[PDB]
Amino acid sequence: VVLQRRDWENPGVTQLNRLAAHPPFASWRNSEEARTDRPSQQLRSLNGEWRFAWFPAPEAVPESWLECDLPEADTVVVPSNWQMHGYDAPIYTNVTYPITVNPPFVPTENPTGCYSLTFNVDESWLQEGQTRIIFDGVNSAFHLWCNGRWVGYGQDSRLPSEFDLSAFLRAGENRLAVMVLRWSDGSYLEDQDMWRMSGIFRDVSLLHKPTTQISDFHVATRFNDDFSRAVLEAEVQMCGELRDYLRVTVSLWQGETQVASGTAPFGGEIIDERGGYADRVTLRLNVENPKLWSAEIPNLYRAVVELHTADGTLIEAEACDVGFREVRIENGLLLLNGKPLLIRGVNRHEHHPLHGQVMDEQTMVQDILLMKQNNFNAVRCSHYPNHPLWYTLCDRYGLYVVDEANIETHGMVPMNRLTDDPRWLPAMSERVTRMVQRDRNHPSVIIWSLGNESGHGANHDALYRWIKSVDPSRPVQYEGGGADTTATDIICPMYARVDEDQPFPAVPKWSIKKWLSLPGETRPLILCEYAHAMGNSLGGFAKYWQAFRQYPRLQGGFVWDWVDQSLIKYDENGNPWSAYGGDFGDTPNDRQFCMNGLVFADRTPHPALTEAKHQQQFFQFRLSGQTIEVTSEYLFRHSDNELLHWMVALDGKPLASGEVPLDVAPQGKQLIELPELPQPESAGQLWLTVRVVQPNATAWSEAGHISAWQQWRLAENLSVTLPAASHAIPHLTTSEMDFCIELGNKRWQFNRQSGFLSQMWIGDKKQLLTPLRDQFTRAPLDNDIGVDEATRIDPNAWVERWKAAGHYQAEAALLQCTADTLADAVLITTAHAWQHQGKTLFISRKTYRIDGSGQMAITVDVEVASDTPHPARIGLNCQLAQVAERVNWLGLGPQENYPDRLTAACFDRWDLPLSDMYTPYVFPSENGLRCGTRELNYGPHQWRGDFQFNISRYSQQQLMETSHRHLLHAEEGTWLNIDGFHMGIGGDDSWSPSVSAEFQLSAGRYHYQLVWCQK
Amino acid sequence: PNHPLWYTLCDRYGLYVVDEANIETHGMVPMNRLTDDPRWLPAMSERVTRMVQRDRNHPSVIIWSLGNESGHGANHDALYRWIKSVDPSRPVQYEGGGADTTATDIICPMYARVDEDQPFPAVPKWSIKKWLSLPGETRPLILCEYAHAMGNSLGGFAKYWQAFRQYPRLQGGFVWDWVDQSLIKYDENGNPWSAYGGDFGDTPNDRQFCM
Amino acid sequence: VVLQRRDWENPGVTQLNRLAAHPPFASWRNSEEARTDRPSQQLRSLNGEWRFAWFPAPEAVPESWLECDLPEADTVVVPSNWQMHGYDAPIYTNVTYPITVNPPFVPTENPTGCYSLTFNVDESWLQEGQTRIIFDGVNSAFHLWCNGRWVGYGQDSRLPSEFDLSAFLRAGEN
């Protein structure tokens, strides 16, 4: 009858015999244990080794499995995804559904995980009370049997499913059997852009409650105008038989100190003509001068809810952490405890490179620490309710959480086809309602979300209203259908730009500054997704932050996103590598579009992370004469763990330093007077750097943690001295094939056929492996490629514009190559034209001046045709013969930085090992650039000027030809790229041209100069 | 919702209709026990949504109703908003929970008096004249049930109509009700007689309260 | 399977295989007939004489009833309330529920009306198109079989439940 009913193709049936949702229970039988949050004897983990067998469909499951173990089955760890154990492929797809769109139907071939466990139950659990089993997460649907008998059915992969096992169990041995289906009608609401996996991927537990039990409880905190008084209100629901002797006590604790307590019998206020709830009571506790919860200072009290007799016998106790805080929208501003928030948020999926979508405490803690160490204060549960511990950790460490229903129907056509259909309202309603019922007591949750990318339908409006009616303590947001519909309290677009409108029909993405002031618009704007961090990205990030700070109602956003969704695969030798979409045989796939993280799957930072840290700083700085002005962007805390270190240096050489304690009130200002600095004699630019240092450890950071920094140019002394006049004069030697120049043990050779420096010698050793040549292209970045799908191609993307114009296949044609002897130098003059099919794209005009001191001065002047797409870079490249250990530079660093992503980099003298000058993006591209460089040192070589550069063992050609980073081989020598000008990287999104006009190489005429010598 | 022909006839003859979802949970304690429970939202939504889908093209229907005597629960709020979103062309009304809740566009009490307050706890029935001017109240008031016409009744009917005519925002109401709910029974001869509650051995019963 | 599920005691199942609701349809194949609101050949009333047997519970219904007319059963007019034919008592109660207040459960003693009708369907409807049946009002819940096979289930006493019969019907008697 179970195989006959086919409940997994019926959206009308989303569970069978499932218990009601409720907040985290442990059924403590001792109050002190509840208060301290110690383990509960009444809550057991069924995690560990289980029996598992795979089947191609549910009809292939033998009727024996219900009563007897299958010897074919293996023993696997639960929780797990069965794709992580090799049983079938994980599918990566973005928009297009991973099954045929035929709702409510799924494929007849529907992979099926048969799980089972043989486990003990103690006798004490069956004489008194109620034993339930809790599956925290099962993807995507399942039937359950206990000792051969059918218990029930559940859908929604991301919320706990609970069943009463009381009548099913026996003392001693019992057997659970779970048939998990990969696909169900639930799948139609689970089209998030991520790995599609399956199985019992979250905790399994057994919970014993008394027959007379606390079955639900809500905590509210409300405040007077200045937050100096609060009323904690607790509504408590019971199940079982009503008795006059029953009582509830809610007591509230600050550490070991009890601050408030209330006790009452059951029976609520009159509600309507038929009375009130005899099975509920509300307790109200006064709290004077409450310690308020925020992401800045996560103050928590403990609330213990005791169900007991009037005489004092405890029946059970539940408990939660309480954060006293108010969230409201007033006059178009989102306020926390009366202060306008600035959301430094990131979207975070649940992902681990080894365990797939199984989460554990350590990874969660690691994520939290990294976020807070990098100046994040908020996280969005993209796009489903998370593992229950996540909320607890956000409560305790202090992050703001957007809790989001597990609803995404992105692949529907149009996007609201299911969400506007009243037949899908039941399935949708349980995903919203059961989330609110579970998470409503976590202070860290400040906003509810109705899901993701499912257009805007009537069902959203209804469920919007349901939440407002049930929980008025939190605003509700939802982006679908244009980000400002009647189903959201917050204008919450994805990838809306700062200044540029994108006026798509029906769902335009207005410039965020313009959106706020549309006639009639009052709401605050907080981007649910912005600054797409796919590969070499986060260009233009500073621009968002400049707008966030200037516009009160622009209250920030959530970066997309936190972690690369790469999975570990093994090679022939058993070495690990990172795999993306289409690497598991899966198709259709969206390839590398799954990796948009600020961190790699193993939590190693991308360079972009430091740019987010710098822009998200909580201290702002201004310099006037000798005075630094520090402004706090903290809303609640003083700077009680902050000191300012300042340093003045001349071209990287320190001249002075000092330390000044920070004592800044929230939103306040401090003036710091610098002492007179010793104005030096020698040339160069003076730079002031300041850093905010946290002297003491916190729960989330080590001692000495740098939380903010800033740099300013001070006095510049321009060099006016003539270099030491040389006695030696270089000697020009000519042949039909070459111009050669000699000075002592140095030698330069210019090919008269190509017109490039083909070789240089120090003593007798050759310096080049490839001639020094103009370069106008880069190995394409993910933002240059502009496809969100492997199928979809775009004629407008930068790489496609460059390809179609002939930039990559453009051949250098020599126009001029003269040599001339001067009084103390040899002067080589060249001209070249790069042409593609009769069209002149670029002209390069150069002079090389080798003088008596051994320096070669190169002057370059490039013309770019106004009607060719603006080039990726204007520079030179070559392959040096030398492979050295270190790279030493005076310029912006230490990390990779680009013209539209360099605010975080500082000007100084930097010294890294060669390997650090390469960024291991999984999809290889142009990488490791450093800008604003005045001097570069590598082995015997030194280049001076004002340039950008990258240096590595990988050619721009190898980088653009290889699809994975583990397939790259170090070439012979070192490839050097020296650019005079380099295009912005962009990243406002990654599926359209995103590089702002001021970062495109559009001037038409370009000029840079370089001095190359041997130190 | 009535027999489909009823709407057609109201279209053609000309009567304003309040089309009402088939939801009444009068017997629950408290009256909103089911309507405030999200697990009952699906059942309730179908009774609202399938009514709108069937009847929305009838000119005679001018107001949608969320049902009757089911208290006020969050499911009412959800379904109120669903209708306002799907069909902006008609006000939505619902009396449960005190006749002036957030799930109604119209103050629609049953048996509220003209001049006399009945201040029940939680669900007071204010004088209709006073109700209109409660601080912050803007809505029109139309009684969903008034002048209970049981047996020898309709005393003071004129008092309603005097107030209906004097107060712009008092826009009338619906008498309870049209037809006696008596069934036909026979004695030993074959003579028909009007039977009410209790006359079919039915117990517990509320007797002549059907008429 | 229909006895094991007990869909009438689960508020999560309010229908099975029911078609979407919609405004009144007649499927005219002539525009002038539509305009004039004259009868449509494609819309047929099944009102009239049906076969009917009363039971005290769904467990007491014999399985033979699925494929064969029961001889005990009487011929009755439909539409009707079976209380108006004397099979059991009509109940009058104001506020207090006529069943024990214990959601979602109903009494095991649950009067069960078994309705059936043998009817001809013409062949034109079988070769092409979609043939559905509409029950405008069924108090309070019901299962439906066509020619022995199960079609679907419906609740809500006061709105029409509609079921696609295209795959269930045959040439001749049904």
Ligand SMILES: O=C1O[C@H](CO)[C@H](O)[C@H](O)[C@H]1O
């Ligand atoms: O707009 C979106 O594009 C992102 C691209 O990485 C990602 O798929 C998000 O889930 C989706 O909301």
Ligand SMILES: [Mg+2]
């Ligand atoms: Mg289903």
Ligand SMILES: [Mg+2]
């Ligand atoms: Mg999507």
Ligand SMILES: [Mg+2]
């Ligand atoms: Mg049912």
Ligand code: NA
């Ligand atoms: Na702002």
Ligand code: NA
């Ligand atoms: Na992505």
Ligand code: NA
């Ligand atoms: Na590549």
Ligand code: NA
């Ligand atoms: Na009036």
Ligand code: NA
């Ligand atoms: Na009555």
